[PDB]
Amino acid sequence: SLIPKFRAWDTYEKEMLENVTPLFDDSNSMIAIITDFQIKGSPGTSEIEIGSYDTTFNWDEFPYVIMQSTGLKDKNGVEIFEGDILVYDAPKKYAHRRSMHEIAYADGRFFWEFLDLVFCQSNILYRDGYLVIGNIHENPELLE
Amino acid sequence: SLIPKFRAWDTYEKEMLENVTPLFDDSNSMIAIITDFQIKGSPGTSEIEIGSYDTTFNWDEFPYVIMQSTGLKDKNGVEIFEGDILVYDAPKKYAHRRSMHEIAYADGRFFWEFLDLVFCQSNILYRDGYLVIGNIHENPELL
Amino acid sequence: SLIPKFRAWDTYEKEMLENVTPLFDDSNSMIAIITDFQIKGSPGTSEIEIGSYDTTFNWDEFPYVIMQSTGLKDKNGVEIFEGDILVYDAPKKYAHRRSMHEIAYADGRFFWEFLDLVFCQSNILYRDGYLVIGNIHENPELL
Amino acid sequence: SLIPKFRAWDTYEKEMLENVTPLFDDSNSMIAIITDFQIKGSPGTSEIEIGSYDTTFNWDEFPYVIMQSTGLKDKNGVEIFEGDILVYDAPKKYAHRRSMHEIAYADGRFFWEFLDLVFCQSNILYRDGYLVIGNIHENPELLE
């Protein structure tokens, strides 16, 4: 099963927004985003009260980039999203260079890039395990 | 890189709703659904006008079951979702069980059940190809 | 990155032979098997001394079925081969059978049948882990 | 199923040997290689006659690197082995090199390195398809 959960990088404000709801037209294009809402009212006469939101008509270039949760967690229990960048949590002693690996989606599955292992919960936790160190938007220096 | 697209089975109305937007609390529980909306503003400024929707306030148990698109298509160009049931498009073997393969997501990937080939667009189309024949909600006693 | 290792089911003796070397002719059909050999040279002129072997000419039906090692081990350190049958080793909660999963190779990977998980070392060992309980030849009626 | 088929790179002579039979002890060390054999003698009384061969006796380090067939074919029907390098057979354009990926085995599967696609027969052949254009031993600068 996979519970749909999304975060958005606001490229104009340079801010990561958690728990957002992307809204699409019937043609697979994002047209709005709800960043906060609450449900109000009584049983049978309830409503969705949108607190904060934005739409593509407000912008020449809509500044939100959406990323979905993989439903997997890292060694410290942090939920892994598309765009996260992970590293093997090696001991400090005899420290040796390690590469970082970005999470992406293709061909029906989430992949970590440049790694021989299959991306799955057991591989994330195996031996010393993997940790999310940042993401491609906030931390592009991790892949330099 | 997967464009999010969802459908919902409404267990109360016994119907499939297309192009829905599920709304979750910050704790993994679905608390509302938007089934139609428009953007309007002339300028309003622009606003989201919810057309049809439901919330968990309205129910003892929220009757909507959400399914996400894999973004892959079957041999007939049908978009494949979680809960779809696929079969290989071969001749029909009369009076014997036909193998059926439910689509689900787990542990980082979508997969089809009971099949040695890996679920991916090229394998869906290879040879005679696979077709969606229905899903586990609209067609409950097939599997 | 995969050490070639083979075992053979002897369908005449009904025994499993370990560390065998299958030999294939130019038609890619198995023609012989080496079950024991030594290297006895002296010292810049070495030789392969085959000590135990068999060939398709010594039989009407060559009674050997070859299975290759996956290179992976089960939770008890047992090397896993094609044709093995694995179970998840959760405690016996009184009176229910563990589901069984045969190992095969196809289309680029070794895999376990009827399972949502990727067949890889970490999944084999995760939590209670998986154990080999038999194989399709020694235990033809297990599945 | 997979018919075991092996090739070996002789790293002393710098030659690829086709269709070899690798011989291992029980500790997983290759100690011999049969490059040619035939079966001889009376039915019921037959023998393996070893033609070309080599053993680890003659060597400080046995100079042969074994690679197994994946069982999969490229767009030209060529059997793909570990160590092969594949390219996507898109129309070639001036001064643009097509991207290359090495075949490896790890942890239960064969795969193409640095490519987020399931390595399977239908993906090898899909759309423009992939072709074997060398291997890491005979063409050690090819990946660059």
Q: Out of A34, A49, A66, pick the residue that ends a domain.
A: A66
Tokens 């354009």 belong to residue = D93
- Do both D60 and D111 map to the same domain? no
Q: Which two tokens stand for residue B39?
A: 């953007």
CB B35 within 8 A of CB B99: no
Phi, psi of C36 (to 5 degrees): -160, 135
State the amino acid at position A93 in one-letter form. Answer: K
Q: Which residues of chain B have a CB within 8 Å of the CB of C114?
A: 114
* C2: contact with A, CB 8 A cutoff: no
- Do both A72 and A54 map to the same domain? no
- Do both D47 and D81 map to the same domain? no
**Assigned domain for B143 exists:** no
Residues 29-88 of chain B with CB under 8 A from chain A are 31-32, 34, 37, 39, 41, 45-48, 50, 53, 55-58, 66, 68, 70, 72, 82
Q: Which of D6, D66, D109 sits opposite C109 (nearest CB)?
A: D109
CB C31 within 8 A of CB C25: yes
- Do both B28 and B88 map to the same domain? no
Residue of C nearest to B114 (CA): C114
- Do both C60 and C79 map to the same domain? no
What are the residues whose beta carbons fall under 8 Å from the beta carbon of C1, sequence distance 6 or more?
Answer: D82, D104, D105, D106
Instruction: Read off the DSSP letter of residue D27.
Output: T
- Do both D61 and D78 map to the same domain? no
Strand partners, A66: A8
Q: Which two tokens stand for residue A70?
A: 């993989």
Residue of D nearest to A115 (CA): D114
Min CA distance, A60 vs chain B (Å)?
A: 14
Alpha carbon separation from D5 to A77, C23, C28, C37, C106 (Å, rounded): 44, 10, 8, 20, 15
**Assigned domain for B29 exists:** yes
- Do both C57 and C106 map to the same domain? no
- CATH number of the domain that D91 lies in? 2.30.30.290
- Do both A79 and A97 map to the same domain? yes
* D125: contact with B, CB 8 A cutoff: yes
Distance CA A5, CA B23 (A): 9
Distance CA D106, CA A123 (A): 13
Q: Is D104 in contact with A116 (Cβ distance < 8 A)?
A: yes
Distance CA D115, CA D86 (A): 11
What are the residues whose beta carbons fall under 8 Å from the beta carbon of C2, sequence distance 6 or more?
Answer: C71, D68, D82, D105
Q: What subunits make at least 3 CB pairs under 8 angstroms with A? A: B, C, D
* B107: contact with A, CB 8 A cutoff: yes
Tokens 């990088």 belong to residue = A9
Domain encompassing residue D44: 5-66
* D111: contact with A, CB 8 A cutoff: yes
What are the residues whose beta carbons fall under 8 Å from the beta carbon of A33, sequence distance 6 or more?
Answer: A8, A20, A21, A22, A23, A53, A54, A55, A64, A66
Distance CA D2, CA D79 (A): 12
Tokens 């016994």 belong to residue = B14
Q: Out of A48, A66, A84, pick the residue that ends a domain.
A: A66
Q: Which two tokens stand for residue A113?
A: 């890039």
Distance CA C107, CA B120 (A): 13
Min CA distance, D114 vs chain C (Å)?
A: 16
Distance CA C126, CA C119 (A): 11
Q: Please write down the HEC assignment for all residues of chain B.
A: CCCCCEEEEECCCCEEEEEEEEEECCCCCEEEEEEEEEEECCCCCCEEEEEEEEEHHHCCCCCEEEEEEEEEECCCCCEEECCEEEEECCCCCCCCCCCCEEEEEECCEEEECCCCCCCCHHHHHCCCCEEEEEECCCCCCCC
- Do both D105 and D78 map to the same domain? yes
Q: Which residues of chain C have a CB within 8 Å of the CB of B115?
A: none
Q: Is C106 in contact with B116 (Cβ distance < 8 A)?
A: yes
Q: What is the largest CA-CA distance in chain C?
A: 64
- Do both A57 and A103 map to the same domain? no
Q: How many CA atoms lie within 13 A of A94 on its CB side?
A: 0
- Do both A72 and A38 map to the same domain? no
Distance CA B71, CA C114 (A): 24
- CATH number of the domain that D31 lies in? 2.30.30.310
Q: How many CA atoms lie within 13 A of D102 on its CB side?
A: 17
Alpha carbon separation from A73 to A69, A80, A91, A107, B103 (Å, rounded): 9, 5, 20, 21, 23
Resolution of the experimentally solved model in angstroms: 1.8
- Do both D114 and D56 map to the same domain? no
